[PDB]
Design a protein around this ligand. Structure first.
Ligand SMILES: C[C@H](CCC(=O)NCCC[N+](C)(C)C[C@H](O)CS(=O)(=O)O)[C@H]1CC[C@H]2[C@@H]3[C@H](O)C[C@@H]4C[C@H](O)CC[C@]4(C)[C@H]3C[C@H](O)[C@]12C
Ligand SMILES: C[C@H](CCC(=O)NCCC[N+](C)(C)C[C@H](O)CS(=O)(=O)O)[C@H]1CC[C@H]2[C@@H]3[C@H](O)C[C@@H]4C[C@H](O)CC[C@]4(C)[C@H]3C[C@H](O)[C@]12C
Ligand SMILES: [Mg+2]
Ligand SMILES: [Zn+2]
Lengths: 219, 48, 50, 51, 199, 100, 197, 72, 75, 230
C-alpha cells in the first residue's frame, strides 16, 4: 500500500581490517541513501559517548612548546601521540593516569600505571622515544568521558577526540528492484580506533538516532 | 491604455522616447506580393 | 536600477543568496546566485535523436 | 538533394531477402522437427521424412 | 518449405493467401489518436468508416454554418430592434410578437425606415448566402478525392504524443547558453534557500 | 511570459499570425474554447449589414515541425475589446506576448 | 553498419572511467540475438520465436537476462569527427533507465565531446576476438596517455579543477586555524564536523 | 567545445596579430637623422619629437605611403 | 569485470597476442567443452580467459601443448 | 554523558490553513540539524496524498478536444483538476461527481460531496461554463498514494484497459510543498547547550502537521530499525 517502504536486504559488511568496515545496505527507496547515511554520519561524527585523553601535564614544560633533554620528539608531537591514544573507561569516569618512565627505547601505551577499568585498546601505541640515558619523562594525563570532538581552542590541553569513529563516509549508488529504475544503495564505510567495532559503531549510532524519535513513532 | 495591456502592464525601463513605432513586421512579404498581383493602371510592376 | 528593484522586495542587493544543500543540509559557503532565468526548450528532443 | 548527395538508388530496400531472424528460425525448425522424428518408431519416422 | 510442411499437416492450419502490411505506430511513440481522415479514390466505394466520417463532416458543416447564421441573425435582429425602440415605439410591446415579423413592422418612412429596409435586405441576403455556402460545402465534402495513380484509398491518423522533459533534451537561455539536461534529481535533493524553496 | 523581456514580445506576437487579434471594437458576446463572438460597437459599425465579428479558433493541428499549433481565448464573456486587441493566444503566447 | 545506434550523451559523474551508461531501450535493441540465445539457453523461452515475442513484450525476466548478457561485453563509443584514435574507445555498459548515453566526464577530453547536444554512436563487437580487442586494445582504462605524446589525456577539466583548487588553498585567518592534527582522517573529521574551514 | 569558443580564439588571434604589425611599424629606437633620406630636407624638430628615429620628412613619407597604397 | 590488462600484457609479452591467446582460450570454453582453470565469479569467457592468462597458467605454448596432447589422447 | 534528552512536540502553530510551523524543543546540540534535515527530506519526499488520477467528462473522447460551453480546452480542465487538493478518510479511492450547468465558473465546491471526502479549498476553480444551456458531467477519481506517479507509467493496468472516455491525469500525491527548518536556542530552565527545531511547512491542506511529522518519524524510525539490527 501507501505505507510500505522498502527495507534493505543487506548484501555486504566486509571488515577489511577489523577496525575498517564497509557496509552495503540495500535496496533503499529513492533518496533514502542520503537521509540515512547523512544522519548516521552526523551522529557518528559529533555525538558519540566515549573516553579520551583531554589534558596531559608534563613536569618539564609549562607551555605547549619547549625542549626536553632525553626525548627527540617535540612536545606538540607528544600531544599528538596522546591524541591517538584510545582509552576505554568502565563505569567510573574522569580518570587520570601517570606515565613516568625512563630508559633507552620507545614509550609504548603499556608503560602507564595500569589502573583498574581504564583499558588501553592498543598497548603497542607509541608515545615518545627517550635517548640513551636515565632520561626522565614523567607525565600526568587526564581523560574524561565526552560526546563529540571538542578542540582545545574551546577551553596543557588537548583536542579531545572523544568519539570512537575516526572516519565515516557513505555513498549512494543506483541499486534496482526488478523494474524500478532508481533506488538507493548505501555504502557506509567506517574506521574506528578500536574502542568499538565499526559494526557496533553503526549499531550504537542508529540506536541513538532511533531513541531520539520516541515521542513521534507510532506502532 | 489598451484593455489587453491593463491586464498585465509590463514595467518598462529604457529611457529613450520612441519616435517611430515598430513597423508591420511582415510588411516585405505582403507588400511585394500584393504589388505583384494587383490591378494597377500603369507599368509600375506586377502582372500588367 | 537592478539593485533598486532587488531592494524593493526584500531580496539581497548583491543578487546572491546562501543556498543550503538539499542532501546534507549544510550551507554552501561562498553565497550563490539564484534568480529567475527564462529557459527555452529547443526541440532537439532526445527521443528523435536516440 | 540531401546532405550526403546520395541518389535514389540507395533508398530501395530488398524485399526478397529473408530477415536473419527468419532463417535462424527455420534452422531451429529443422532442429525441432528432427528431434520430434527421433522420438518415433523408425517406420513412422522414415515414412514422415520420405512423405 | 520442407518440415514446415510437416508442421502444417500436424496442426491442420492453412498458410493464408494474404500477408499483412498494416499501419502500426512507430516504435517508441505513445499517444492518443485524435483524428482520422479517409481519402478514397473516385472509382472505389467508401467503406463504413469513410461514410461515417462523411456523416460527421456534413453534420458538423451544417451545425457550423447554422450556428454562424444564427449569431449573425441575432446581431441583425438586435440592431433592428434597437431601431424599433425609437420611432416605432413598442418598448416591450415588441419583445413578444414574431421577431421574423420585424422586417415588415411599423415606423415612419424616415432614414430609420431606409435603414430598416436595408437591414431586412441584409437578413434575406444572409439566408440566401449561407444556403448557397452550405450547398457548396456539402458538395465539397461528398466529392471524389484525387489521388496518386495506383492508390486506392489513404487513411491518415494523427497521434498526439505528449513529450515530457527528460535527460537528453536541449534547453537554453536566450543568451546562447545551450545545455543538455543530464539528470532530473528529486526535489529533496535540490539546493534550497534559507526560506525553504529549492532552486 | 518573460519576467525579463524587451517589450518586443507584444509586437512580434501580434504581427505574427498566430494571435487572433480583434478586427473591430466591441463587446465579447459569447466566448468559448473554440470561437469568440464580438458584438461590434455601433460607432465602429457599418451602416447597413450590421453583423458581428465571429472568429473561429484553430484547435489542435500540426505545424510543419509537428509541434501543436492551437489558439486559446484570453478574453472573458462581457469583457470589452478595442480594435487591435488580442482575443486568443496562439502557440507560445501569453496575452499577446511571446512566451517561448 | 549493423548493431549500432546513436543518441545524446550526458554527464553521469557517478561512473568509473571504464563504463558508460546505456539506455535499456538502446541496450535491448542492439543486443537482440544475444538475448534471444540466452532466453532459449536458460529455458525461459521454448523457441526463438517465443523469445522474440517475450522480448517485444519486455517482461520482467527479459531485463535480467539483458543485464546478464551485457556484463563483460564492452561496447565501442565513437564520435562524429574521429580526429584521432581516441575518438573510438570501448566501455563496459552500465544499463541506464533513460534515453541518453551517459559518458564519463574525464573521457570528453579525448572524444572532444561536450554536453550541449553532441551525439555519440555506440557499436557492439560481436565475435570473441572483437571483445578481446576492445577490452585489451581499446578500453577506456587502457588509453590514459595521449598517443601524440606520453602526457595523459585524462586531465580533469573544469568543475573538478575548480573544486580541487578551492579545496587546496588557504585563507589568512579561517576557522580552526593553527591547530595540529593527528592525520588526514582527523582533517576530514574536523571539516565535515564544521570546526575548520 | 563550441562554435563561439573557437570563434573567440580566431578573432583574438586576428586582433592580436593585427595590433602587432601596426605597432611594429611604429619606431621605438633612437637615432636622430635630421635629413630625409630621399630628399635631404631637414626633418623639423617636432616631427622628430613625436616619432624618435624617423628617417623621412612628412612630405616624402606621404609620397611613399601613397605609393604603398597600390602595392607597387 | 576486469578493467586493465596491464599484468596480462606483462605476462604474455606482446599485446596483440594477449588478444589472440585470450580469444582462442575463451573460444575453447564457449565452443569447445573445456572447464575454466580459475574460479569464475559470474565471469564471461573472455574475461575468464584473460584472468587465466594473467596469473600465468595459460598462454601460447601451453594451449598448443594441450591441443597436441588432446590429439594424442585421440588414439 | 550519554543522556540525550529526546525531543517532544512543543506548541504547534497553524499560521494559516496550510502554513503550519511545528516545534520540537529539547534537542541536544547537534541533533537539531540531523533531525531537521532528515525530517524535512522525509516530508517532501514520502507522504500520502489523495490526488485525482482518472477523469471522465461526459462527451469527450480525448483531452485534445473542446466541449461547447466551457471556455477552456479539456487539457486545461485536466490541468485545473490535477491541482485539486482533496482529503479522503474512509476508503483509498472514490469517484466524485461534478454536475453543473449554466453560465459561471465551475469550482470544486460544486462537486457532489460524500461523507468520505473533504474538498479543502472549495473556491478553487475547475472550469468556466459560458453558455446558457451547456453542462459538464464528469466523474473524477481520487485515490491515495505517495510521491509522483505520472500518467504514462500507470497505464499498464492490464485488463479492461481501457474505455475511450477515461482520461488519466498525472497523480501528484504529496501534500507538502515547502519545508524549511530552523535550529534556535532552546532556553530550557538550566542548560546552555540546547536547541529547539522549528519546522515550517506548507501543505495543500490535506495533511495535519502533527500527523505529518508523526508519519515521517515513523518512516525514518523503521528504516533505522533495519540499520540497528544489522
Ligand atoms: C526522405 C526523402 C526526403 C528528403 C528531403 C524522401 C525523398 C524521396 C523518398 C523516396 C521516394 O519517394 C521513392 C520511394 C517511394 C516509396 O513509396 C517509399 C520509399 C522511397 C525510396 C522514398 C523514401 C523517402 O521518403 C525519400 C528518400
Ligand atoms: C446571448 C445572445 C443573445 C443576445 C441578446 C445569443 C445570440 C446568438 C446565440 C448563439 C447562437 O444561437 C449560436 C450558438 C447556438 C448554440 O446552440 C448555443 C451557442 C450559440 C453560440 C448561441 C449562445 C447565445 O444564445 C447567443 C450568443
Ligand atoms: Mg557540441
Ligand atoms: Zn622627403
Amino acid at each position: 500500500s501507501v505505507t510500505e517502504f522498502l527495507k534493505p536486504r543487506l548484501v555486504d559488511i566486509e571488515q577489511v581490517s577489523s577496525t575498517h568496515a564497509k557496509v552495503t545496505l540495500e535496496p533503499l527507496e529513492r533518496g533514502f541513501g542520503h537521509t540515512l547515511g547523512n544522519a548516521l554520519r552526523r551522529i557518528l561524527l559529533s555525538s558519540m559517548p566515549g573516553c579520551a585523553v583531554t589534558e596531559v601535564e608534563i613536569d618539564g614544560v609549562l607551555h605547549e612548546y619547549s625542549t626536553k633533554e632525553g626525548v627527540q620528539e617535540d612536545i606538540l608531537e607528544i600531544l599528538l601521540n596522546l591524541k591517538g591514544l584510545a582509552v576505554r573507561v568502565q563505569g567510573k569516569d574522569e580518570v587520570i593516569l601517570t606515565l613516568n618512565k625512563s630508559g633507552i627505547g620507545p614509550v609504548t601505551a603499556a608503560d602507564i600505571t595500569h589502573d583498574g577499568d581504564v583499558e588501553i585498546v592498543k598497548p603497542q601505541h607509541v608515545i615518545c622515544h627517550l635517548t640513551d640515558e636515565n632520561a626522565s619523562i614523567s607525565m600526568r594525563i587526564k581523560v574524561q568521558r565526552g560526546r563529540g570532538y571538542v578542540p582545545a581552542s574551546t577551553r596543557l590541553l588537548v583536542d579531545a577526540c572523544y568519539s570512537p569513529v575516526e572516519r565515516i563516509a557513505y555513498n549512494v549508488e543506483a541499486a534496482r528492484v526488478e523494474q524500478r529504475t532508481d533506488l538507493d544503495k548505501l555504502v557506509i564505510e567506517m574506521e574506528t580506533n578500536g574502542t568499538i567495532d565499526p559494526e557496533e559503531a553503526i549499531r550504537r549510532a542508529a540506536t541513538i538516532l532511533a531513541e531520539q524519535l520516541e515521542a513521534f513513532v507510532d506502532l | 491604455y489598451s484593455y489587453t495591456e491593463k491586464k498585465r502592464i509590463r514595467k518598462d525601463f529604457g529611457k529613450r522616447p520612441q519616435v517611430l513605432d515598430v513597423p508591420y513586421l511582415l510588411s516585405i512579404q505582403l507588400d511585394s506580393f500584393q504589388k505583384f498581383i494587383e490591378q494597377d493602371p500603369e507599368g509600375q510592376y506586377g502582372l500588367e | 536600477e537592478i539593485k533598486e528593484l532587488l531592494k524593493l522586495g526584500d531580496l539581497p542587493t548583491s543578487g546572491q543568496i546562501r543556498l543550503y544543500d538539499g542532501r546534507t543540509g549544510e550551507q554552501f559557503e561562498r553565497p550563490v546566485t539564484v534568480g529567475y532565468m527564462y529557459m527555452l526548450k529547443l526541440n532537439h528532443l532526445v527521443d528523435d535523436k536516440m | 538533394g540531401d546532405d550526403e548527395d546520395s541518389h535514389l538508388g540507395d533508398f530501395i530496400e530488398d524485399t526478397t531477402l529473408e530477415l536473419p531472424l527468419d532463417s535462424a528460425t527455420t534452422e531451429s525448425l529443422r532442429a525441432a522437427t528432427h528431434d520430434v522424428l527421433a522420438g518415433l518408431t523408425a517406420r513412422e519416422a522414415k515414412v514422415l521424412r520420405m512423405r | 518449405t520442407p518440415e514446415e510442411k510437416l508442421l502444417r499437416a500436424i496442426f491442420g492450419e492453412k498458410a493464408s493467401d494474404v500477408k499483412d502490411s498494416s499501419l502500426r505506430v512507430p516504435n517508441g511513440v505513445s499517444g492518443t489518436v485524435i483524428d482520422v481522415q479517409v481519402f478514397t479514390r473516385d472509382g472505389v466505394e467508401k467503406d463504413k468508416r469513410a461514410l461515417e466520417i462523411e456523416e460527421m463532416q456534413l453534420k458538423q458543416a451544417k451545425k457550423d454554418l447554422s450556428e454562424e447564421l444564427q449569431i449573425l441573425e441575432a446581431g441583425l435582429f438586435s440592431r433592428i430592434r434597437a431601431v424599433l425602440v425609437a420611432g416605432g415605439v413598442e418598448a416591450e410591446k415588441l419583445d413578444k410578437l414574431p421577431r421574423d415579423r420585424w422586417l415588415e413592422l411599423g415606423l415612419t418612412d424616415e432614414e430609420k425606415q431606409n435603414q430598416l429596409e436595408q437591414l431586412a435586405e441584409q437578413y434575406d441576403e444572409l439566408k440566401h448566402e449561407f444556403e448557397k455556402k452550405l450547398e457548396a460545402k456539402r458538395r465539397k465534402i461528398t466529392q471524389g478525392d484525387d489521388l496518386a495513380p495506383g492508390v486506392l484509398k489513404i487513411v491518415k491518423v494523427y497521434l498526439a504524443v505528449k513529450r515530457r522533459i527528460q535527460p537528453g533534451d536541449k534547453m537554453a537561455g536566450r543568451h546562447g547558453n545551450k545545455g543538455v539536461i543530464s539528470k532530473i534529481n528529486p526535489i529533496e535533493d535540490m539546493p534550497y534557500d534559507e526560506n525553504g524553496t529549492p532552486v | 511570459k518573460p519576467l525579463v523581456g524587451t517589450g518586443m514580445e507584444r509586437a512580434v506576437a501580434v504581427d505574427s499570425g498566430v494571435t487572433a487579434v480583434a478586427k473591430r471594437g466591441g463587446v465579447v458576446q459569447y466566448v468559448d474554447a473554440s470561437r469568440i463572438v464580438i458584438k461590434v460597437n455601433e460607432d465602429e459599425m457599418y451602416p447597413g449589414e450590421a453583423g458581428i465579428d465571429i472568429y473561429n479558433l484553430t484547435k489542435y493541428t500540426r505545424s510543419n515541425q509537428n509541434t501543436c499549433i492551437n489558439q486559446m481565448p484570453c478574453v472573458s464573456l462581457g469583457e470589452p475589446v478595442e480594435r487591435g486587441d488580442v482575443l486568443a493566444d496562439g502557440p507560445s503566447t501569453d496575452l499577446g506576448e511571446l512566451a517561448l | 553498419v549493423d548493431y549500432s545506434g546513436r543518441s545524446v550523451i550526458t554527464v553521469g559523474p557517478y561512473l568509473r572511467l571504464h563504463q558508460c551508461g546505456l539506455p535499456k531501450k538502446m541496450a535491448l535493441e542492439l543486443f537482440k540475438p544475444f538475448i534471444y540465445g540466452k532466453l532459449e539457453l536458460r529455458g525461459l523461452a521454448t523457441t526463438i520465436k517465443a523469445a522474440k515475442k517475450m522480448v517485444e513484450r519486455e517482461e520482467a525476466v527479459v531485463w535480467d537476462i539483458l543485464d546478464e548478457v551485457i556484463r563483460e561485453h564492452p561496447v565501442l563509443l565513437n564520435r562524429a569527427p574521429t580526429l584521432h584514435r581516441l575518438g573510438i574507445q570501448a566501455f563496459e555498459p552500465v544499463l541506464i533507465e533513460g534515453k541518453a548515453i551517459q559518458l564519463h566526464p574525464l573521457v570528453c577530453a579525448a572524444y572532444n565531446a561536450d554536453f550541449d547536444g553532441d551525439q555519440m554512436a555506440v557499436h557492439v563487437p560481436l565475435t570473441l576476438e572483437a571483445q578481446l580487442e576492445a577490452r585489451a586494445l581499446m578500453m577506456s582504462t587502457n588509453n590514459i596517455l595521449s598517443p601524440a605524446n606520453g602526457e595523459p589525456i585524462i586531465v580533469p577539466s573544469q568543475d573538478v579543477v575548480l573544486g580541487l583548487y578551492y579545496m587546496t588553498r588557504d585563507c589568512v585567518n579561517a576557522k580552526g586555524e593553527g591547530m595540529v592534527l593527528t592525520g588526514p582522517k582527523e582533517a576530514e573529521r574536523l571539516y565535515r564536523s564544521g570546526l575548520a574551514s | 567545445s563550441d562554435e563561439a569558443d573557437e570563434a573567440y580564439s580566431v578573432t583574438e588571434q586576428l586582433t592580436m596579430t593585427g595590433i602587432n604589425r601596426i605597432r611594429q611599424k611604429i619606431n621605438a629606437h633612437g637615432i636622430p637623422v635630421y635629413l630625409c633620406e630621399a630628399c635631404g630636407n631637414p626633418i623639423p624638430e617636432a616631427r622628430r619629437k613625436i616619432f624618435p628615429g624617423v628617417t623621412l620628412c612628412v612630405e616624402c613619407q606621404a609620397y611613399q605611403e601613397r605609393q604603398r597604397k597600390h602595392y607597387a | 569485470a576486469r578493467v586493465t590488462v596491464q599484468d596480462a600484457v606483462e605476462k604474455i609479452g606482446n599485446r596483440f597476442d594477449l588478444v589472440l591467446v585470450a580469444a582462442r582460450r575463451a573460444r575453447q570454453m564457449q565452443v569447445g567443452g573445456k572447464d575454466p582453470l580459475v574460479p569464475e565469479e559470474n565471469d564471461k569467457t573472455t574475461v575468464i580467459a584473460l584472468r587465466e592468462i594473467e596469473e600465468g597458467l595459460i598462454n601460447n605454448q601451453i594451449l598448443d601443448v594441450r591441443e597436441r596432447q588432446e590429439q594424442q589422447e585421440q588414439e
